[PDB]
Amino acid sequence: ISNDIAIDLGTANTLIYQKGKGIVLNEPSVVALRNVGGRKVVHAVGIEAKQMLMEAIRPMRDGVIADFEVAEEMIKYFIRKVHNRKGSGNPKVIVCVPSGATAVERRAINDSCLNAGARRVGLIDEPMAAAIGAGLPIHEPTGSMVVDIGGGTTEVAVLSLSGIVYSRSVRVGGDKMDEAIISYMRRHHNLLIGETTAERIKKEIGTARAPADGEGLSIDVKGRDLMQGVPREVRISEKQAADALAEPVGQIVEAVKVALEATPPELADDIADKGIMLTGGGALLRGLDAEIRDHTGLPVTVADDPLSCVALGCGKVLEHPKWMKGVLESTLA
Numbered sequence: 270i271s272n273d274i275a276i277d278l279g280t281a282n283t284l285i286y287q288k289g290k291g292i293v294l295n296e297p298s299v300v301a302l303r304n305v306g307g308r309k310v311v312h313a314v315g316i317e318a319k320q321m322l323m324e325a326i327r328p329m330r331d332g333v334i335a336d337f338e339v340a341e342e343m344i345k346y347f348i349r350k351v352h353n354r355k356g357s358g359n360p361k362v363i364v365c366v367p368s369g370a371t372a373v374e375r376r377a378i379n380d381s382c383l384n385a386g387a388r389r390v391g392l393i394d395e396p397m398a399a400a401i402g403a404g405l406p407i408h409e410p411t412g413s414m415v416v417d418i419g420g421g422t423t424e425v426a427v428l429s430l431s432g433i434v435y436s437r438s439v440r441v442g443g444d445k446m447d448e449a450i451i452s453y454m455r456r457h458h459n460l461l462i463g464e465t466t467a468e469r470i471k472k473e474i475g476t477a478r479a480p481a482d483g484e485g486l487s488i489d490v491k492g493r494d495l496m497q498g499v500p501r502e503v504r505i506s507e508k509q510a511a512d513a514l515a516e517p518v519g520q521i522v523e524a525v526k527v528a529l530e531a532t533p534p535e536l537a538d539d540i541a542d543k544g545i546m547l548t549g550g551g552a553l554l555r556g557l558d559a560e561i562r563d564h565t566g567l568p569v570t571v572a573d574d575p576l577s578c579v580a581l582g583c584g585k586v587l588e589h590p591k592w593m594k595g596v597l598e599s600t601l602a
């Protein structure tokens with residue numbers, strides 16, 4: 270029985286695919302730090318940390334390693350958590366990393382896996398894993414565009430010839446959408462709300478396009494009054510949430526358009542045929558596909574299972590390592 274794993278080390282969520290088992294771990298990429306005698310201690314990791322949240326730290330939140338020690342501890346914790354005692358002790362590991370990850374960041378990730386016992390580590394770039402999981406024909410000379418909207422980043426890439434031809438990331442994704450909602454409630458309604466409430470609003474009435482409709486549906490939002498601090502409830506409409514999200518949505522649209530203008534022709538025309546493939550959790554924002562379509566004049570398809578696409582692509586590379594080439598940049602023990 271195998272301990273080989275592929276890790277989607279996301280800005281917001283970490284997923285681990287295990288050989289012969291599938292996705293065995295899907296947890297937020299968060300650590301709870303405790304202050305003990307002026308020292309900071311990694312007290313809890315993942316869903317256990319989120320459930321007890323001490324200071325919250327998301328060490329990968331912006332698509333770069335913010336805290337190396339904490340990121341390493343988080344990686345080791347997750348690897349240890351999925352380890353099977355009755356399985357091999359020296360597994361092969363794949364980790365998905367952002368395209369712009371630096372040598373130092375990549376070395377840190379490789380070392381984390383080697384220090385947890387891996388006999389070999391291969392790194393794969395996020396948009397390649399996303400394309401593979403979305404089922405894009407990244408072997409053909411046909412141009413493909415994938416737009417992966419995650420937590421702290423959106424990555425856009427043009428693929429062909431088993432390779433990335435263009436890639437660019439911007440620090441706008443689902444986190445900035447939540448922050449926009451938090452900011453809207455504070456400035457427009459004098460109401461302090463937390464990330465959990467912001468995410469519920471985004472999922473329930475959040476949308477990339479205002480209702481022609483008028484104001485659309487509405488929900489009740491519970492928070493604390495800004496000046497007072499007393500619990501207060503405020504009704505918010507789909508129109509209002511659309512207003513709140515307009516700015517980060519606009520920045521995601523701009524990222525796609527910037528990528529398009531930088532797309533080396535020939536490839537331009539291969540794109541307007543089958544369009545753009547959206548993946549990542551951020552792609553689940555209602556109407557974002559239509560909004561991108563309307564402002565690029567390009568067709569837009571949302572990948573099946575956009576939250577899991579990267580993990581499933583990594584898993585496919587893990588299971589069928591002969592299927593493709595040098596998608597992996599590898600390091601042995």
Ligand SMILES: Nc1ncnc2c1ncn2[C@@H]1O[C@H](COP(=O)(O)OP(=O)(O)O)[C@@H](O)[C@H]1O
Nearest residue numbers: 279280281282419420443444549550551553554
């Ligand atoms: N139904 C939904 N509507 C809008 N956003 C969503 C939905 N479900 C999840 N998300 C968002 O997806 C983002 C996480 O996407 P993910 O691809 O896991 O990011 P990363 O790979 O960077 O960790 C979060 O900001 C989360 O709020």
Ligand SMILES: [Mg+2]
Nearest residue numbers: 279280419579
């Ligand atoms: Mg991701």
